[PDB]
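Annotators were shown the component list below and the corresponding predicted structure, then asked to write short factual statements about the assembly.
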Amino acid sequence: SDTHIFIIMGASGDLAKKKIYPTIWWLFRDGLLPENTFIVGYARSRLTVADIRKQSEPFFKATPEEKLKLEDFFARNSYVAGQYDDAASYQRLNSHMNALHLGSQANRLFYLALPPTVYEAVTKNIHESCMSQIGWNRIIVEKPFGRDLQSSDRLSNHISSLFREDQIYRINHYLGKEMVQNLMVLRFANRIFGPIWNRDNIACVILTFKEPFGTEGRGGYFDEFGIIRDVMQNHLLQMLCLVAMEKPASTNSDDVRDEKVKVLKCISEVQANNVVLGQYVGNPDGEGEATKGYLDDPTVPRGSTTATFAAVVLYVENERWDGVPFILRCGKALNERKAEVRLQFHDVAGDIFHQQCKRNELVIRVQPNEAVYTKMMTKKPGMFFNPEESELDLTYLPDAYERLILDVFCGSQMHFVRSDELREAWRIFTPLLHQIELEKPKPIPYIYGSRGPTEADELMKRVGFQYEGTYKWVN
Amino acid sequence: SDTHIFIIMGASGDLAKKKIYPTIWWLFRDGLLPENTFIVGYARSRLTVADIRKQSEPFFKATPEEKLKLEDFFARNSYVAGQYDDAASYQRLNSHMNALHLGSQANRLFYLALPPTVYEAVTKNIHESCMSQIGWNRIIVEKPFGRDLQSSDRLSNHISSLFREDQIYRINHYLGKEMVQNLMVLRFANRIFGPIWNRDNIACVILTFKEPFGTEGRGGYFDEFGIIRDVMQNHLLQMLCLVAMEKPASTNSDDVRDEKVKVLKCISEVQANNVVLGQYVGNPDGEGEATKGYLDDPTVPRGSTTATFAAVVLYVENERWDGVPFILRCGKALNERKAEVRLQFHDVAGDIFHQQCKRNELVIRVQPNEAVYTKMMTKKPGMFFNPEESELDLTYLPDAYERLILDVFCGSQMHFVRSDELREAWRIFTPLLHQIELEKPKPIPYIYGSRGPTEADELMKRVGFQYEGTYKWVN
Amino acid sequence: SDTHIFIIMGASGDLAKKKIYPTIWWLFRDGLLPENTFIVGYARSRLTVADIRKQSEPFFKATPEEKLKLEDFFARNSYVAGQYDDAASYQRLNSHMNALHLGSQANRLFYLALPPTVYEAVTKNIHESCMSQIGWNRIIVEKPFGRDLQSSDRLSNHISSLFREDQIYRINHYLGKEMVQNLMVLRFANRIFGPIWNRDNIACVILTFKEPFGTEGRGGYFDEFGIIRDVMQNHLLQMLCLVAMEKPASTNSDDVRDEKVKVLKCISEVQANNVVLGQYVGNPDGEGEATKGYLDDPTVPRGSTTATFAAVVLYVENERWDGVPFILRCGKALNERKAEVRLQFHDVAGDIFHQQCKRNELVIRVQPNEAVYTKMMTKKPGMFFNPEESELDLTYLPDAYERLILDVFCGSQMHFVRSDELREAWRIFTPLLHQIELEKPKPIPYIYGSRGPTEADELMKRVGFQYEGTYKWVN
Amino acid sequence: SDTHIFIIMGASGDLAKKKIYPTIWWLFRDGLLPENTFIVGYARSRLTVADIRKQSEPFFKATPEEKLKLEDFFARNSYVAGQYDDAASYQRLNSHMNALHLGSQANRLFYLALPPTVYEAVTKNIHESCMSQIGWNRIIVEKPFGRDLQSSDRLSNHISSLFREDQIYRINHYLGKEMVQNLMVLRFANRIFGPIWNRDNIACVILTFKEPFGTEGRGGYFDEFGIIRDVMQNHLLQMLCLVAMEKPASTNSDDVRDEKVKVLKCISEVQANNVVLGQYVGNPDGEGEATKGYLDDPTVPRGSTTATFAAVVLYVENERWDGVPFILRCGKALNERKAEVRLQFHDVAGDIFHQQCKRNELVIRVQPNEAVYTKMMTKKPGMFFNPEESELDLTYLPDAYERLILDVFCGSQMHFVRSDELREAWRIFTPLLHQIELEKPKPIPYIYGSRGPTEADELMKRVGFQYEGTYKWVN
Ligand SMILES: NC(=O)c1ccc[n+]([C@@H]2O[C@H](COP(=O)([O-])OP(=O)(O)OC[C@H]3O[C@@H](n4cnc5c(N)ncnc54)[C@H](OP(=O)(O)O)[C@@H]3O)[C@@H](O)[C@H]2O)c1
Ligand SMILES: NC(=O)c1ccc[n+]([C@@H]2O[C@H](COP(=O)([O-])OP(=O)(O)OC[C@H]3O[C@@H](n4cnc5c(N)ncnc54)[C@H](OP(=O)(O)O)[C@@H]3O)[C@@H](O)[C@H]2O)c1
Ligand SMILES: NC(=O)c1ccc[n+]([C@@H]2O[C@H](COP(=O)([O-])OP(=O)(O)OC[C@H]3O[C@@H](n4cnc5c(N)ncnc54)[C@H](OP(=O)(O)O)[C@@H]3O)[C@@H](O)[C@H]2O)c1
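Structure shown to annotators:
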């Protein structure tokens, strides 16, 4: 078995200490990492391994039973202090990596837990000095991947000029979730969902990502990006790609991402008449943080028109999806947390039940709870021939971040955004973002803890989604 | 509201006193019958209303709370004695009905609770004497409807020579069942079951009717008919009609039965190579009645070759169902009681999961514990890309006999066998029955309480059904 | 071979002498008739077989070569004079038929070449007297089959109370045409036309029946009926049934007509907003009869609002045809003679040719120059990838009337109107005709020899047909 | 307009003088070339422009009408003598091309009319020296592209290590033909061919490429490759890709070639039991060249087992084409010249015409006499409901080589083989070629001018093509 080096650049970061070190700790605890794996930190701060332990222990969730295993894990941890644009520091880091046991032929896995501003310099210096000559070299890149098409293209071209596509792992936490990964099996392993997954049967597709909390203090970081860049551009667009994607030639990462980019290439730029933007305000009847609006945050610049809610309608102009509205819906400070995929089917042609039938709906809920159910019509128990709404419910381990790190280790790139997919997403959403920043349109206020602006429901009804509300469900 | 007269002719019979009088009582108690309803008996034996009450109270399921309603219901009861082929007795019956309040313009409902041996004279005399000149006159005919094509045609032609098709209600108890009626709503009120309900997606259709008990003493009655005449000719064939039926022009009884006859007309005569026959033997390890075989029943003639189990393969040679085998499976003294419709779908074209996928199966269980579920593949919780078997479960008043009698009262003929339906069924099953009764083939023995002969499973596998056995289910 | 008697009542009429006698003559000349066939005329006016021959020979197309065959044909011809409501005259007719050679056991074929005003009396007398007790008895009934639903139902009930549905042959010469009969073979014998023959691929259906001549003197006959009763109710509706009908269980006449009536039962009543009516005026620049308008006919009542042109939109509200408009267009004094069926298909979904693609069209031209072609896109010969409109063309005996008479002889009722089909057709068109006859709407005038009112084209464009005009065809 | 330099490497070759110089001559004559276009030759043998004239005007198709334009064409011609592996000679060529007017900024188009033995050196030295710094540089590479997967991978890796994929134009003279390019418009611009172009409707696909002549005096050259490498690996495989490919996202060359390689990736390696090989023998009753067999050629080594005929069956294991056999048929010295795409459709489900219907066939004849027709069933003019086979027939400039060169000039790579396409084709056909070369199986002899071995027809029948032979066609 080959040896591996997990280089954590910016190991002093909050993201590092709270998510990366605990994740590799759990992976080593479960015996999932390669046996010969060395964790090497790298940041400008003068820190030590004890200095690390002190900062990472309360997030480690370490019970006293496995203190020996924790000591064994932290034995292989090491830290190098250096600057992100200092060739001498990068040479020192490379020398230290070669100083570890069998470090010259080790597989190098650099995790860039850094702000995007230093990504170019870090990648350039890594490619210059710290690349292994025998093993592979894979780089984990964190969002944001630029703020528009031009900046994203600049960063992507800089990274791609040095590293191959198989060496770049743009990490998205949402792509590793079980229901998100179950979408391909649900679609392509079942005959029941095959013939109906087209424009001849589906009336509209609704993709939802709701959060019940606001900016909760760190509103200044969210102000410069907005909800479209936060959620719509990546989460909902990956959901759309999985829902609308053709069947791949195989389960290979290249084939899956080829289908995803092919679907993305058939989407036109978003227009402002298909977009509803909202910004949450305080709830006087609420408790705690519900009473504070988006602008009530001191870190948020005054007079900000950043949208905390967005509802856009996309169209995939291909054979399978021509004319089917794809409604992307997300927001913050909403009434509940939910990540959902909903397919509303057309009315049954030649209805013989006197307009009593409702549209079939297939729902794939990703969170809070995993649930795949289809709403369908069934005969009402009684005397007359009246259908009523019913439902078929689907009846029925490392977490998503751990599986993503294991995917980087094992070379599976199907859960990571490719360069062409990123370019297509940015080209889809860039004219709208440019118009928004140029004109500063006022978002529609909505009360903290509500469902959002009513204009979103109006847009859904206009594009084709008919909400009934008469469907009653009991657990 | 017009007056209705329910003439239970044969009121001294076991079927009458055990099912018809209690059903009429329950319908009257719930108020489902019209407010002006008179029940008139007719049989050779000389009884009275007191005698009928005495012999029907044990099966009455009455309570002391509504003894007043009991006495009110028997207040409208009456009885005319006489011969079933006596013009004077039928004149007396007609005169009694006229002497009843509003009895000349009253609707007359004749229930023929008599052996088919007298049906000819009974119906002829009813038409000649007891026909009402104002209200409608409908006759309820009980099984058997003949033993083969020729006898059934004789009886049906004689009955139709007197009564119109809208006056004949050939009753079978299973068409009034909840899932049997829900099949049409499931098929034609839902978009998700439309495009897949054809030969391009469905590999085979299995219609199952299993019972856990044998002839239990009355084997002489079953010896004259056999399992094919008892179950396949009516129950499983109605199931096949409902499953393979085209969408009717409307929910009218004429349209529904027209579609059913159209489906029946596309089925060729049953061939012997597609039939597996079985006769149950005793279980040495059984408990009580289960230890006696079919030939171990006094009433059963020695050397009888009457099959208690049958498994035939039918084909609906039309555009929707060409090449799809319809497997009709029924038997007695089997391992369980079950009426079920199972659709097995084809393999997903262009498999990308390395042959790990299993065929989708839609199951509609009429009884026991009615349920609709689809066996389908879902992603196995883990790291690798492997599907696993799961299912979507459908989640969630007078019974079939009173619903059928209410249908006769209302004039709905949807759940009653039409003359052309009967003719098509008999022309389908008549060459096989004649061959069986001529060559006297020996049925394959199977132990009381088993799944039947293994030749049935071999036939299912040959025609295309592939059983897996790897699908494990827990409530 | 059994002997046949062909009774032509109204043998002195123009229809008889110009179509029936020549047709029987040609059938006998070609040997298509049964060997022992006798032709018996019947009319009030007294004449002889010599008079019939003298008055019918110009239309006989007789040549000196077959003079002996002509004398053999007239050796079997006979004439009987009598009233249409005289039992004595009908007894004399029966006696003549019986005195004919093997006339008591012959097959009797009554052609009612009479106005419908005496149809009831003729049929009643036929049933009372002239029925054959050994051979079959079939009557041929000519249009009009009533003026509305009520009159049609009255006449149909009178005829059906005396004759079975298998004895009534309501003759419509349009159903006997080659392309009209080839519609079924084209639809149900070809895999290419199967999957596309539904609402998911067809945008609209146009049924056209144009005539280039006006009433031509006999406008008084046309005034009380109009174009809807003349052409729409029978020719266009039969073509609609054949185009929209489901696949029959077999090629039996009963199955085909069951499918036709099943389609007719799915069509709602015609609404006035889906109807364009027109009445032609004279062409001042025309030559001959083209200069006279509809009202210029002296027999036409002054100020008549009878429409010589109609364009209605019908909808077949079933699974296959839900939402597809069926445009029925017929008119007199138009620019050409044409009987055509046109299916315009939907635009290709996800078009990759920059909107250069035109809708596919399947055209079945019944007359003149019966041709089947489909307009399709092909690559333009050149350097760029531009599709251009092209087409696939179909490439290379008794006529319709003799075919229909032979069908009556051999007992095939496929190309004849059934009672339920007639009832559904009048159900569809009766409220509109009543509204027209009550409100007396003024038809849109149009010039003799034109394409009709432009409101018809506007209605087609509104309901969904898009005329291109860029399609160029060269013979 | 930019200036272009068309460098003809190996300009003294037979291919050059017979096809390339006439093609650019015609392009310049018709004003399709760029206005500033200089043609430069380069070969080891010391010729001049006068020698090029003396050797190329026999095939120039030049008439005295355009003699001035001819002399203007060779006014822009030039010739440079040098070795194909000489850095000094290639520097001299670069100096000449710079000395051309505006040759420093000119677009460079290197046509490699050379044997593949020197391709590596020529490409490496072209990249080293003769690459423009402002204009683009495109290289046209001729077949063969290696003899198997390993050699093809070697050559492709060597070429791609220097030139980008957008700079390499692997020329296949077949992809530029009119009928070949119309396949994509026929499939994706027409709704009539959409729903039926799948496995649910198509029984088998036959791809044919027949020649009526053997290997006239060049059997020694054909011997080293064989029919599979000559025709099957490129022509028939490109035809298969065009027939079976999914709809591209757009008409971009990259999208089209991605679809093509995606289809290629779904094909497994060819098995020997699906391959029929043949080698033509002399015809004793033939005339002239037909009397000599393949081994009668003195250039053919004695005992050669090279196949001049091949019939293989391929399968595209994806959702659209799973189970449909793709029969590739090619051979030399056959009965005719023909290249054709034939799609035989399945039998119509639920036949109601008593097994008289034949399978529909869609035929796209690339050459000779480009035609598209669909064999289909139509009613036989007569008395009975009897279908008979008919056909819908498609109805009534630079050549393929000129259009391919113009495509290179315009930068269109749609009709050129990509690296992944070549690699996938060699992967498909390499195990079979290795097995043939190792085991040396004897090809089945067939007579010059016949249809080939009967084993090919047997294999077609076995895989599913049912030849009828009852279809009659007249022009
Ligand atoms: N649970 C069931 O029993 C059951 C279930 C399914 C279907 N059925 C069908 O329902 C029908 C009702 O018959 P059943 O079950 O009630 O049997 P049943 O009791 O033997 O016959 C009903 C009554 O008819 C009279 N009867 C019997 N045999 C007769 C004969 N040869 N001729 C004239 N009258 C005769 C008898 O009364 P009188 O002596 O006064 O004439 C008898 O009480 C039968 O055809 C049976 O096939 C019954
Ligand atoms: N080519 C056509 O004209 C044509 C085409 C299609 C359908 N039809 C239908 O076929 C039927 C035949 O009519 P037709 O065209 O032949 O015109 P017709 O001459 O008026 O009818 C034919 C015979 O009907 C008799 N007749 C006329 N008026 C009568 C009346 N009030 N009472 C009793 N008998 C009367 C006459 O016989 P006697 O004078 O000897 O009593 C006449 O010879 C019509 O209903 C017409 O709608 C005709
Ligand atoms: N019509 C066709 O023949 C045809 C058709 C399709 C494809 N192709 C492909 O195109 C390529 C062009 O070859 P060709 O048909 O033109 O035959 P060719 O005349 O023998 O080769 C072309 C020129 O290349 C030079 N040459 C020949 N052998 C050479 C060698 N071992 N090493 C270096 N240079 C050599 C010669 O010029 P110098 O002696 O002056 O250097 C010769 O005139 C062939 O490989 C063939 O696969 C040919």
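Statements collected:
1. The CA atoms of residues 281 and 447 of chain C lie 5 Å apart.
2. The pocket of NAP (ligand 1) is lined by residues B 10, 12-16, 43-45, 84, 113-118, 142-143 (CB under 6 Å).
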